[PDB]
């Protein structure tokens, strides 16, 4: 059905870190993480987030969740962050579509 | 009783080509004349069967694959084609028996500022076999050095967004595609036409 992404909004000072969690919801079928991405204010572009260095990700099939962690936050990290998953659906779990979380609006100050 | 072809063509959502969908059609009657007598398709090509004769034919099973690609890639959805789509996303066999149908879907699948929700695979260690599907997301090692799951030079994420913009010319616009496979095996037929 859907992906529940938390937190929906966030404010942090420079140096802190942000953790985002995405829970696959209303699914009796399997799913997989596709990627995370950001939209910068005033732009429609989706910038995929490459996982390395200060971007750490994890996946927890037991809890039907996947997460992203961002360390050493800077002002330019202010953006809305999204999680994308590929989810099987339908009676026999025979179809698949991509679903996005509703996003985390990150504001970074100082 | 009546095959659910409406659900395939009319579906509000379509798959990304790399994660293409397949619907098995069986134990039902199919009136294909509704398709071929429709002028809303930009491509309608059959291989090994004449579409007008479908309404008087029976098959063991029918399969309906669906996905979105750009207009100038529809050419790759044919037997014996090469290209990123044919090689790395959706491959028909050389002896394909079925029909390829497509139409411009700019008015559903384009978005102002760009629709990034349709993806394709850009790299792969080897070509797909016919009707193989690959939904993996491993970093692609394009040079000699192992990537160890980290992106960088010659270490590439293998999926890429189309980014369909309404201001794009028609070759770059999204096309919805339906591939019908007609399977004939030594078994009772379960998909027949109205005759
Ligand atoms: C899609 O739905 C409309 C509903 O009015 C129907 O007339 C049409 O035949 C359907 N398309 C197909 C391919 O069955
Ligand atoms: Cl994490």
Residue numbers in the entry:
A (entry chain C): 20 to 129
B (entry chain A): 334 to 528
List passages from the publication reporting this PDB structure:
VNARs are the smallest (~11 kDa) naturally occurring independent heavy chain-only binding domains in the vertebrate kingdom. Here, we detail the identification of a series of VNARs from a VNAR phage display library screened against the SARS-CoV-2 receptor binding domain (RBD). Crystallographic analysis of two VNARs found that they recognized separate epitopes on the RBD and had distinctly different mechanisms of virus neutralization unique to VNARs.
Among the 12 interacting residues in SARS-CoV-2, only 5 interactions are conserved in SARS-CoV-1. Among the 7 residues that are part of this key hydrophobic interaction, four were conserved, two were replaced by residues with similar properties, and only one (L452) is lost (see arrow annotations). For example, Ala348 has been replaced by Pro335, which is a non-polar like residue when cyclic, and the aromatic residue Phe490 has been replaced by Trp476. The final major difference between the SARS-CoV-2 structure and the SARS-CoV-1 model is a result of the deletion of a residue equivalent to Glu484. Lastly, Ser63 forms a backbone h-bond with the carbonyl of RBD Gly446.
